[PDB]
Design a protein around this ligand. Structure first.
Ligand SMILES: [Zn+2]
Ligand SMILES: [Zn+2]
Ligand SMILES: [Zn+2]
Lengths: 208, 208, 208
């Protein structure tokens, strides 16, 4: 009826899956545990990829600052660009020739930025503005199109959200069986699954 | 029993709603799809309105900086105020005479700020402090009371959270029917519904 | 069957709990309301503690800036350290001799920072670098080990997430009974429970 302990005549989501022995029950419990882990890693993983897309900020920081520059306040705009250029260079698609091309474009960006600052530190204004207009040639050349990284990330995240929703309902359905062994397997799988993929995000860098 | 394909003797949440024909099933599937979309737009919409309340920051940034000013470090405090004043002016209640009054108060704020900076750039300190004390007369006049925008937003968001919770349980109950056509309708409605209201937040500005 | 109004032969999650009188029903409704509140406060409380761990930022801000310092750009690095040192001092473990020791170490940090700035404002560079190397002796002495605050917070949050997951399933199971009085009790408990613990986070400081 209602929170029972059993390994007999217990159906599990699908007509083919029924468990009538203890050895079947452990296999059912192991799967419902693993599904409960998989879910927690899915939700946390899906967030981590969403936060990494930060790129959208850096990308807007660069392009917003170019219009801000295009009157010796330019140096502060370019120092904001340099910072944004370096965090943007670290970026990588989720698990190399396009990357090596992308990364090496950003080196040229950061170098050009330093040269435009070198004019602003000496005091030269109009010339530092002319150099910044050349900067937008470089981002078009290397960085702009590869935007691919951002589109890939959004789709991947849509695909994951669907799977996250299916699994949630599936875990509701196994809990709804009212079998205390399955229910506990889910609960324990939620606890430990969260703890582990929580720990792996702490292994990767932690800011904000 | 357990993930069946059917359009016969299928009850849907309410005693009055039962579906015994395929033409009824499509109507049931269309409603459970739409409910699954509506939910995803509700959760995303409810977040977007919560992030927009940013205003709370700008409002505290202004008032925190006034006490910080009230010793030539004032210029940096007022430049923080100016930025905060302009993002605060963009704000608008969720879907005009009070607004036009509110917006036009902020113009006067930003202008007064520039005049207090003009003293600080020349080097004049005590006079730039006296001008800032007049700034708090202006926010009281126009901005302060209209705080209404913030209270409206919090209540709206409470109202939405309730509806978000009802719908979630309702979608659990339709999935719990174990009818594979309804279950799929929800799952598909979660996928596409998320994708669309995800896309509309990308249509609106994207920072942080 | 399907959204019924009743106080007769209604079972509630456990074989021992069955309700056959109206006076039992109110007790069931009060418990399912309270569980619905408790859940909302759990989710919001669990977030508030996660945001407070901010400390991780300040802690990395200090240690990142020390390597940045160890060429008169040091003053801006130390002013970032001072800010980070003061928000870090406000911190406290969730509900005093270790604290008084921890807080008083941070005073010494902020004072040492001011002295290193006093050299940078006069123009002295190499000496301001030598003072910063002494700063890392002080954090080791007082702050570093008490990291305990951070580890305590992560475990507490793991413990809460488990309980949050159990309660969610439990509230699904009471809603699944299809008793309109229990269902409403949950829905109302979600509405009001959210509103209150939403209001208490607004009582505590609100930034970002
Ligand atoms: Zn979770
Ligand atoms: Zn979703
Ligand atoms: Zn909620």
């Amino acid at each position: 009826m209602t929170f029972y302990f059993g390994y007999t005549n217990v159906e599990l989501l699908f007509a083919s899956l029924v468990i009538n022995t203890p050895g079947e029950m452990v296999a059912a419990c192991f799967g419902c545990f693993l599904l409960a882990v998989l879910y927690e890693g899915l939700k946390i993983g899906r967030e981590f990829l969403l936060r990494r897309n930060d790129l959208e900020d850096n990308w807007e920081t660069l392009n917003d600052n170019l219009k801000v520059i295009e009157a010796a306040q330019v140096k502060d705009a370019l120092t904001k660009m340099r910072a944004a250029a370096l965090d943007a260079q670290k970026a990588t698609p989720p698990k190399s020739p396009e990357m090596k091309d992308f990364r090496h474009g950003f080196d040229i960006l950061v170098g050009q930025i330093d040269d435009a600052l070198k004019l602003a530190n000496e005091g030269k204004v109009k010339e530092a503005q002319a150099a910044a207009e050349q900067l937008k040639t470089t981002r078009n050349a290397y960085i702009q199109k590869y935007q691919r990284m951002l589109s890939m990330a959004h789709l991947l995240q849509t695909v994951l959200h669907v799977i996250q929703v299916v699994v949630s309902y599936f875990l509701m359905l196994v809990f709804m069986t009212y079998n205390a062994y399955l229910c506990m397997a889910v609960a324990a799988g939620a606890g430990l699954g969260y703890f582990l993929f929580s720990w792996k995000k702490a292994v990767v860098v932690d800011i904000t």
